[PDB]
Design a binder for this molecule. Structure first.
Ligand SMILES: [Cl-]
Ligand SMILES: [Mg+2]
Lengths: 267, 276
DNA sequence: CGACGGATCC
DNA sequence: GCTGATGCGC
DNA sequence: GGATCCGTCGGGCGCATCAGC
């Protein structure tokens, strides 16, 4: 039932040391997450890049503590005009854009060797009320990512709001008709991997590892039972797999109903 | 007439010793400047804080020697987004600043790489590469609008902390601030609009021109010389680069230097000594 | 943008 | 990869 | 007529892009 992420491999298959550390966190209430000492974990993880999803915080209400990360001094925010995302970078991105070209869910940062996308994929909702909107969003998102990656290697991170396979969640049989494990959402994630193309960094390295989740409902004490879902991903262009050192699930960092995830790249 | 910067005054008027040395340099292309040995001057100057303008270089392309600067290990870089190769500012600090921010309000959408704000314990340092009004003044109005947005931005800094504004403000404030005031009144850097904009910056914020406060009547003191026509050798130049201080800081002012002899750009470095 | 040439000032 | 032309802005 | 004013003009630099190879 319960899961322990393996230690960080900071060396590429070919032996190159990790030069790039990306953390992504659905903080599910940036302000609450700040109060729950979220920045303490950021300061400790010291990523080169931090992606936040479901911030639920207008730009003009962003806490002042965020200005106290000179190590992530380039901060970009996208507000929803129940979402919101942030991208914080140590180095100055070459260019930063918002949305999928077409609700505050996607930021795109261009760097030297790759393009970073963070995404807060829309939840299909209780009773699947927004499943269809999710299905359209998935296709539009797939389309959008295809063009990006047809110009530069791609890292896609964030809350993709789908458990790809049964191994990616605790109770597949009871969730095959809930948001995040519908055949439609699962198909969309499979299409996303196939069509872009992209590799599930974590699953590429831990193909056989069960019980590794990134989200647990606040309710029923799901997190302490590790009754959860892997909803947060680092997806990678195949051309970046040689640089892949590790893809972590930070199961024990608190402050949200998601835990953070961490990517290591030898770039 | 040639100019010789007076010796470094390292003690305040009241006798208090300088504790903070800030250099500012428009390096006119950071990769060029390093290959013309600009970093040798930085190591000789050994400033606590180095602000650079016109880095013309995105962060991925910073030369490795810039990591070989152990006394300036906290490095903050900003390059424009559509116009890489132009602008670009850098702030390098011995100590780590409490807060760093970029731009003057909406850099996450502007992404101009002209302005770096760094808050330290006792003050707020802004370095700016102020947009040039252009040949034929074609971007003067944008420069007037920028000036006003910058004024209001500097005004609305939510710190009681005194302010240090440094860098290439891209205007000779008064006639004493360039060699040819009359023939340049319609040239970028010396229009009434930019001069008034400078004057309103000092009055609005409010700020004092550190060098001019110490050397109110000293002429021929410039920080920029066009590469063309051996202007520098003739010391036909402009004072474009400044240290501007909140009034609270003046008694802490020991000296504002023009490092006329340092080569490697068409600007020379300026240096502030503060007794903090 | 400083050099240059040409006009204007007394 | 490298040079040097061109373009653009300073 | 020396000084001064004023408008025009050629051009040094750095870096991106592009063509060529
Ligand atoms: Cl930076
Ligand atoms: Mg310049």
């Amino acid at each position: 039932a319960l899961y322990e992420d393996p230690p960080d491999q900071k060396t590429s298959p070919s032996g190159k040391p990790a030069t790039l550390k990306i953390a992504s966190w659905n903080v599910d209430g940036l302000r609450a997450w700040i109060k729950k000492k979220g920045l303490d974990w950021v300061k400790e993880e010291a990523p080169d890049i931090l992606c936040l999803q479901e911030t639920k915080c207008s730009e003009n209400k962003l806490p002042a503590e965020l200005q106290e990360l000179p190590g992530l001094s380039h901060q970009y925010w996208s507000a929803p005009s129940y979402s919101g995302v942030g991208l914080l970078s140590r180095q100055c991105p070459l260019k930063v854009s918002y949305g999928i070209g077409d609700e505050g869910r996607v930021i795109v940062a261009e760097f030297d060797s790759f393009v970073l996308v963070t995404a807060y994929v829309p939840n299909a909702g209780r009773g699947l009320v927004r499943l269809e909107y999710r299905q359209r969003w998935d296709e539009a998102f797939r389309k959008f990512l295809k063009g990006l990656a047809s110009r530069k290697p791609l890292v896609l991170c964030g809350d993709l709001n789908v458990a790809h396979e049964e191994i990616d969640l605790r109770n597949p049989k009871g969730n095959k008709k809930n948001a995040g494990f519908t055949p439609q959402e699962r198909q969309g994630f499979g299409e996303l991997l196939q069509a872009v193309p992209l590799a599930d960094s974590f699953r590429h390295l831990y193909p056989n590892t069960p019980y590794a989740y990134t989200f647990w409902t606040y309710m029923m004490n799901a997190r302490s039972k590790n009754v959860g879902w892997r909803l947060d991903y680092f997806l990678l262009s195949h051309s970046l797999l040689p640089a892949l050192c590790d893809s972590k699930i930070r199961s024990k960092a608190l402050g949200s109903d998601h835990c953070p995830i961490t990517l290591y790249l030898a770039l």
